[PDB]
Amino acid sequence: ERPTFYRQELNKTIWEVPERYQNLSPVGSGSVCAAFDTKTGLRVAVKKLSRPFQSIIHAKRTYRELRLLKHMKHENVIGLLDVFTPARSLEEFNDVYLVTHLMGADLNNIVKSQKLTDDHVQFLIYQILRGLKYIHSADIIHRDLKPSNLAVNEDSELKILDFGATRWYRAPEIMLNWMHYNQTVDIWSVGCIMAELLTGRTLFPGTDHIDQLKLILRLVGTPGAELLKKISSESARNYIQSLTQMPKMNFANVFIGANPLAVDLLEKMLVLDSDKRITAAQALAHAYFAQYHDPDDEPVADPYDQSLESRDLLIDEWKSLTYDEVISFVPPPL
Ligand SMILES: Cc1ccc(-n2nc(C(C)(C)C)cc2NC(=O)Nc2nc(CCOCc3ccncc3)cs2)cc1
Numbered sequence: 001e002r003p004t005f006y007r008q009e010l011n012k013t014i015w016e017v018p019e020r021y022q023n024l025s026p027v028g029s030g031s032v033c034a035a036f037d038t039k040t041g042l043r044v045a046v047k048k049l050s051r052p053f054q055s056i057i058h059a060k061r062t063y064r065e066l067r068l069l070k071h072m073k074h075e076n077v078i079g080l081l082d083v084f085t086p087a088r089s090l091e092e093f094n095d096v097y098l099v100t101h102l103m104g105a106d107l108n109n110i111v112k113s114q115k116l117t118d119d120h121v122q123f124l125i126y127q128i129l130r131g132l133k134y135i136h137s138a139d140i141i142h143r144d145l146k147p148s149n150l151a152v153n154e155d156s157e158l159k160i161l162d163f164g165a166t167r168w169y170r171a172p173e174i175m176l177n178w179m180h181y182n183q184t185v186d187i188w189s190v191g192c193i194m195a196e197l198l199t200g201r202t203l204f205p206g207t208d209h210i211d212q213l214k215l216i217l218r219l220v221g222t223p224g225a226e227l228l229k230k231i232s233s234e235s236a237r238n239y240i241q242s243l244t245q246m247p248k249m250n251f252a253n254v255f256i257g258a259n260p261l262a263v264d265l266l267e268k269m270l271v272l273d274s275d276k277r278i279t280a281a282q283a284l285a286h287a288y289f290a291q292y293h294d295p296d297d298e299p300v301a302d303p304y305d306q307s308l309e310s311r312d313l314l315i316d317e318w319k320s321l322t323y324d325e326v327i328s329f330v331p332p333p334l
Pocket residue numbers: 032045046047061062064065066068069072077078098100101102103104105135140141142151160161162163164
């Protein structure tokens with residue numbers, strides 16, 4: 001019942017993998033190998049976790065990443081094809097390998113800093129939003145959505161993932177270290193991605209943190225009264241009160257020649273006040289996605305318990321809990 005493993009040697013480490021996985025070729029530092037899975041006939045990424053139980057911190061991340069990927073089962077969210085260890089018992093458990101689909105590209109490798117047709121933009125943003133609907137219904141905020149976190153195959157089929165400038169896609173409240181993120185920080189990132197796919201150009205290419213916030217304010221305006229009332233920081237309150245009011249720009253004069261439904265969607269994504277931004281569920285119902293939208297095929301997740309990973313446990317306890325997740329893993333049907 002236990003598969004037969006082979007001990008090869010890549011990127012200065014003894015990988016030990018099941019025989020089904022062949023032609024292991026390294027692709028970037030855990031360290032990840034590309035492989036061919038003879039059991040399914042798929043090209044796969046095998047990730048050897050790095051020093052998973054070296055420290056409490058490593059042990060927690062290992063367990064958090066494994067737990068969450070096991071939970072994630074949606075076409076537009078990365079998921080697990082397999083999880084394995086060479087260990088036969090908990091007492092020798094020291095390495096964790098994760099296996100997923102090999103996509104071949106991220107969104108930059110697809111975009112090449114070029115304009116996409118309006119139709120292609122629809123299909124790509126629809127899939128991001130559909131994947132965010134699922135994630136957000138699990139009560140998870142991504143927080144670092146950007147093109148390098150989006151895997152795309154040749155047919156432009158898209159998966160959201162998290163590899164663990166980047167700041168270009170970050171919501172203003174995150175740049176400013178507010179400590180109460182709503183899920184629409186991810187919608188902010190979607191809006192920045194969409195703009196750039198439509199225009200060929202980064203929407204906010206800040207040279208640095210302050211510049212990034214100057215660029216944002218230029219597009220969306222300085223905070224109104226309703227937003228200013230929501231600021232608890234006195235020093236933040238004061239500084240904003242001291243700014244020269246700037247009007248919000250008219251997006252049609254920024255996205256010249258785009259579909260006006262794309263323009264209208266961008267106006268609903270890139271609202272300074274995060275409470276006033278469109279949600280993922282809402283955005284999928286927007287007429288921009290009329291050709292792709294299907295209310296009966298836009299699934300939600302069972303809610304996910306994040307308190308399990310926020311515990312303060314001993315190394316051996318995280319390890320024994322990670323071991324259990326390895327053992328209970330059930331692959332998907334193919
Ligand atoms: C500590 C922690 C916990 C959770 C997460 N999250 N949260 C998320 C979502 C569920 C999106 C919120 C996803 C992840 N994690 C995640 O994506 N991990 C990855 N594993 C690989 C292995 C294969 O790489 C190459 C490859 C992949 C695909 N196509 C070609 C090449 C890639 S990305 C991150 C860190």
